Design a protein around this ligand. Structure first.
Ligand SMILES: CN[C@@H]1CCc2c(ccc(O)c2O)[C@H]1O
Lengths: 281, 329, 281, 50
């Protein structure tokens, strides 16, 4: 009976992620006024979240619940490829949104001229292309196949398919996906918070008669709490194989997955987005 | 001094009341309603670099001209969505545009007192910038290929031929903000910043009649296709219809829900439907005779700023504060 | 036919490229409104920003003489100190000595394009036209309190500022406020001919704010300037918060640092608009 | 003081009864209704836009 409830929970999570991503994409695309220079990045994030929630989350739920992968070895490799590509695309899109906010705040006059629709399209294309170069090629080709005695049979066996990566690819993939974007957005949001504090101090000084803390705090904390533990345990298991069990790995991975559905709740709170959502429904 | 004027005004009001045998809605109660009307967006013209102010349909139903605050007055082809010409106005701001019934020349207003005339028919060149006024311009129109009627930010409305103002109308307490022309070239009417809306005779140069039934600024004046009536759009939600023969307010169009202002007013080919834009993001359609709304057109994101109907009456084009100009059929 | 369609397409294309360039240059620049009242020292700021002129100066002198008239040879041509002493009652106007329709001024501060507006209307119907300018430069003369109309001139300026502030179409427009004739204000305050408390009763109970010590000036002058600044600022502050801020700047005719001040304040306005966006502020 | 003269000039005009004007307006609206592409539904082939 425990598996039965887990299946319902996983189906609900997948449905919620799909619905949120679809709503965000439809709101961004249907209305021309809502679409803007910075909304292309949100569109890319929503597209990545939708693709992940329609490709890996349902297949991942099917794999974990049944404990047997019915599809072939090539199809499982392709599924893992899509999973890692989606994760890196989402995190890099979050990093790009953060750097866009930093450029808009720290350099206001140069922001409009530097960034245009063509610039947004080319930077999004570069993000997706670098995500592809980091995900597809090392995993579609058999670089990532484990050299360990364990899981060699599992990779050979069709029904069994679990992630056993080389000691080298895991660290590099984690660095390109999460760690570097983590540093970039942490520094960027520290700078933006410093600018906001300076503006608040100036306003208080000019006119005698914690808001920035809440928004930055939620935006950074959701992403960090969702993804950092998984991207530290994956390195830890490579460094120490006996430390990390499979259940911990899976649980942390799915907790990180839920960030895909959490992202629309944190990147669509603007009143224009709410009005568009109300009109669409 | 003013006692004679007050007595004359009281006598005029008494005479107007004496002529009110029956209300327009009293007769219209027998007629059938037009019913609900669904209006789609056949095309969404775009390209303007900033907010637009006014637009005027061409003599033919195809070509139209759009005027924007960016200074780019671009001529559009409604059928194929093509920008035939792009005329950069010398003045940074334009407040009105006009299209010649011949189609040869195109007029552009502006916040500057100077009114410019562009000879569209290779490269567009300004024909002869007009003399000017004391204030800005509000609305321009073409009696023919040689005469342009302009409304100013001062009281005076003028007819311009040669850079010469043949006539200089006057009598408005405030600033005239819009005007319209009758199907014939003999008569035209204009609004004002004050509630007064007047009818002028082009040949005589004297305001034959004055209508002051409003209570706020008048922003738009449309003219009945028959030529015996004209509709006014005030700053307050109420829009009303005047009859030149009866010389008073025959009907009044308003609703409790609407509280926003009115920017542009235009009729249909048959005159049954009064298409009025609002300061809100929507645009309303009213049954002129029955004084009942028959549909809501809320395509634009920003407030609407201009309307128009082709001479053939094929479709009604609304230009908004946003860069998007949408043709509604 | 086909040829006609092709031609139309080519023309549209030619226009679209030119229009894209025009949109780029338009977005590069900024728009500022100058709301200088009549004889309020507005021309001083424009001069600070930067034969026939001699004839214009002579005409201005003749107009001043006619205004004073409103000896016998002077009157027929159209006690000198008497008019200057009673210059408060009636409106009166006035290379280096000479300096001491719609007008457009274009200048660059830090390689960023700027464009200045100058209109000038009791109705002020054209005010709603400028709903897209970066900021409004509203100048005022702090010495206008002595001059009386028919409400004093400074009170009229306060009423105009209140009307501009509480406008539906200007709900997203900030105001930069310049208090011209600071030296003249100090000169009038030092002399006992006009008392600020005599014209504004609230000045008797008013006291200087504790943390306001801008310049090395007798206390009375500073109290007067801070009263005027507070009277201007109260109407702006009590209306609401967000996308609305007044930036009072005490300025002198000689001082030429205003051009830097407008650039810095416009940058601050853009930065604070972005901060208010994204729900940060 | 020409305002009173203008008002007197405008007052000396014959007025048509409101009932007659309303009847004429209704007659015109009913006569020209069939030619309005907006009042009646727009035919797919007839409408150049659609
Ligand atoms: C089933 N576990 C996969 C495989 C490893 C991996 C994931 C996500 C992001 C990455 O950068 C990875 O290297 C996980 O979704």
């Amino acid at each position: 009976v425990w598996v039965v409830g887990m299946g319902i929970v996983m189906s609900l999570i997948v449905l919620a992620i799909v619905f949120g991503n679809v709503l965000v994409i439809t709101a961004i695309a249907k209305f021309e006024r809502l679409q803007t220079v910075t909304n292309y990045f949100i569109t890319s994030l929503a597209c990545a979240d939708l693709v992940m929630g329609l490709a890996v989350v349902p297949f991942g739920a099917a794999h974990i619940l049944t404990k047997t992968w019915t599809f072939g070895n090539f199809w499982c490799e392709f599924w893992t490829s899509i999973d890692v590509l989606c994760v890196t695309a989402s995190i890099e899109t979050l990093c790009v949104i953060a750097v866009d906010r930093y450029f808009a705040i720290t350099s206001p006059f140069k922001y409009q001229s530097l960034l245009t629709k063509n610039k947004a399209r080319v930077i999004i294309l570069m993000v997706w292309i670098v995500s592809g170069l980091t995900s597809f090629l090392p995993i579609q080709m058999h670089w990532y196949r484990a050299t360990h005695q364990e899981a060699i049979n599992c990779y050979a066996e069709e029904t069994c398919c679990d992630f056993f990566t080389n000691q080298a690819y895991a660290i590099a993939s984690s660095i390109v996906s999460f760690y570097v974007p983590l540093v970039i957005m942490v520094f960027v949001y520290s700078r933006v918070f410093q600018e906001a504090k300076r503006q608040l101090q100036k306003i208080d000084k000019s006119e005698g008669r914690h808001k920035a803390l809440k928004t930055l705090g939620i935006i950074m904390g959701t992403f960090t709490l969702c993804w950092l533990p998984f991207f530290i345990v994956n390195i830890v298991h490579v460094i120490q194989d006996n430390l990390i069990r499979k259940e911990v790995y899976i649980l942390l991975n799915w907790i990180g997955y839920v960030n895909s559905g959490f992202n629309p709740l944190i990147y669509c709170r603007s009143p224009d987005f709410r009005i568009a959502f109300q009109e669409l429904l | 001094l003013r006692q004679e004027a007050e007595q004359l005004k009281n006598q005029i009001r008494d005479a107007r009341k004496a002529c009110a045998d029956a209300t327009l809605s009293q007769i219209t109660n027998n007629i059938d309603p037009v019913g609900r009307i669904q209006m789609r967006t056949r095309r969404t013209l775009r390209g303007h670099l900033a907010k637009i102010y006014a637009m005027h349909w061409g003599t033919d139903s195809r070509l139209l001209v759009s005027a924007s605050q960016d200074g780019k007055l671009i001529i559009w082809d409604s059928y194929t969505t093509n920008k035939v010409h792009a005329i950069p106005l010398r003045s940074s701001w334009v407040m009105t545009c006009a299209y010649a019934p011949s189609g040869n020349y195109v007029a552009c207003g502006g916040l500057d007192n100077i009114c410019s005339i562009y000879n569209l028919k290779g490269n567009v060149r300004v024909s002869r910038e007009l003399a000017g006024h004391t204030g800005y311009l509000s609305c321009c129109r073409f009696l023919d290929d040689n005469q342009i009627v302009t409304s100013s930010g001062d009281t005076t409305c003028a007819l311009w031929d040669t850079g010469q103002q043949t006539t200089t109308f006057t009598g408005h307490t405030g600033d005239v903000m819009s005007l319209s022309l009758a199907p014939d070239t003999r008569l035209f009417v204009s609004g004002a910043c004050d509630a007064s809306a007047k009818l002028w005779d082009v040949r005589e140069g004297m305001c034959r009649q004055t209508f002051t039934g409003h209570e706020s600024d008048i922003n738009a004046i449309c003219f009945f296709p028959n030529g015996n009536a004209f509709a006014t759009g005030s700053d307050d939600a109420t829009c009303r219809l005047f009859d030149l023969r009866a010389d008073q307010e025959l009907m009044t169009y308003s609703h409790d829900n609407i509280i926003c202002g009115i920017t542009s007013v235009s009729f249909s080919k048959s005159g049954r439907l009064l298409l009025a834009g609002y300061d809100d993001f929507n645009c309303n359609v009213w049954d002129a005779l029955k004084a009942d709304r028959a549909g809501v057109l809320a395509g634009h994101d920003n407030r609407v700023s201009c309307l128009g109907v082709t001479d053939d009456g094929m479709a009604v084009a609304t230009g908004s504060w946003d860069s998007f100009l949408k043709i509604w059929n | 036919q086909r040829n006609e369609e092709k031609a139309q397409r080519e023309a549209n294309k030619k226009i679209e490229k030119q229009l894209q360039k025009d949109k780029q240059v338009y977005r590069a620049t900024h728009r500022l409104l100058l709301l200088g009242a009549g004889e309020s020292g507005k021309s001083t700021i424009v001069k600070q920003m930067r034969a026939t002129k001699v004839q214009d100066i002579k005409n201005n002198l003749k107009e001043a003489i006619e205004t004073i008239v409103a000896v016998d040879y002077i009157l027929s041509v159209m006690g000198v100190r008497a008019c200057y002493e009673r210059s408060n009652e009636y409106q009166l106007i006035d290379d280096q000595d000479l300096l001491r329709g719609i007008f457009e001024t274009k200048f660059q501060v830090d390689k960023v394009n700027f464009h200045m507006f100058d209109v000038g209307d009791e109705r002020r119907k054209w005010i709603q036209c400028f709903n897209d300018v970066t900021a409004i430069i509203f100048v005022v003369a702090s010495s206008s309190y002595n001059m009386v109309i028919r409400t004093n001139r400074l009170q009229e300026a306060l009423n105009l500022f209140k009307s501009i502030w509480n406008n539906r179409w200007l709900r997203t427009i900030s105001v930069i406020l310049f208090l011209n004739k600071q030296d003249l204000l100090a000169e009038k305050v030092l002399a006992g001919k006009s008392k600020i408390e005599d014209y504004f009763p609230e000045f008797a109970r008013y006291t200087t704010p504790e943390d306001a010590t801008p310049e090395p000036e007798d206390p009375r002058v500073t109290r007067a300037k801070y009263f005027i600044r507070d009277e201007f600022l109260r109407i702006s502050t009590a209306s609401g918060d967000g996308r609305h801020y007044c930036y009072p700047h005490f300025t002198c005719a000689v001082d030429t640092e205003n051009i830097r001040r407008v650039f810095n304040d416009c940058r601050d306005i853009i930065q604070r608009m972005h901060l208010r966006q994204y729900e940060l502020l | 003081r020409k305002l009173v003269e203008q008002l007197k000039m405008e007052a000396n005009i014959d007025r048509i009864k409101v009932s007659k004007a309303a009847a004429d307006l209704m007659a015109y609206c009913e006569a020209h209704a069939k030619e309005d592409p907006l009042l009646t539904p727009v035919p797919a082939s007839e409408n150049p836009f659609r």
